[PDB]
């Protein structure tokens, strides 16, 4: 065994690229080195300088796998927004090992609805 990897969670791709502030959708995270205990939490930056957001999202283990992470996009603090918000998320694996933050954004539905 050589110095290759450190059992760290990787994120190849993620879809849908974006979603509505409402969420309540099925988000699939493509990658590898995933664990059945890993968690997916979202974060939000404030006009103060520090970010603080605790929102848990349902995780479907049945769909998720060693190289798959399926969860239910959580609800954004502010839903009645006329403008989209840029947010990020990561995966918690272990104590030191973690995943990189992905560039996400919530689009308003008040105007653009299906």
DSSP structure class, residue 56 = B
Instruction: Say whether the peptide bond before residue 16 is cis (omega within 30 degrees of 0).
Output: yes
Q: Quick one: how far is CA 103 from the chain centroid?
A: 9
Q: Quick one: how far is CA 15 from the chain centroid?
A: 10
Report d(CA 113, CA 70) in Å as an integer: 24
The domain spans of the chain are 1-114
Three-point CA angle 30, 97, 1, nearest 5°: 90
In angstroms, the Cα distances linking 97 to 40, 51, 55, 92, 109 are: 14, 21, 20, 7, 36
Rg (C-alpha) for the chain, rounded Å, is: 15
Q: Which two tokens stand for residue 68?
A: 């798959």
Class of domain 1-114: mainly beta
Give Cβ neighbours of residue 86 (< 8 Å, ≥ 6 apart): 103, 104, 105
Q: Which two tokens stand for residue 47?
A: 């006009």
Which approach determined this entry? NMR
Q: Exposed (0-12), middle (13-18) or buried (19+): which is 28, by Cβ within 10 Å?
A: middle
Report d(CA 108, CA 20) in Å as an integer: 6
Which stretches within 1-114 are classed as H helix?
none
């Amino acid at each position: 065994g050589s110095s290759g990897s450190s059992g760290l969670p990787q994120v190849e791709a993620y879809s849908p690229s974006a979603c509505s502030v409402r969420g309540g959708e099925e988000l699939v995270l493509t990658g590898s080195n995933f664990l059945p205990d890993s968690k997916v939490v979202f974060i939000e930056r404030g006009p103060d300088g520090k970010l603080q957001w605790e929102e848990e999202a349902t995780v479907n283990r049945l769909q998720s796998n060693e190289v798959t992470l399926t969860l239910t996009v959580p609800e954004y603090s502010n839903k009645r927004v006329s403008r989209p918000v840029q947010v990020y998320f990561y995966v918690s694996n272990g104590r030191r090992k973690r995943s990189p933050t992905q560039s996400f954004r919530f689009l308003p539905v008040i105007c653009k609805e299906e």
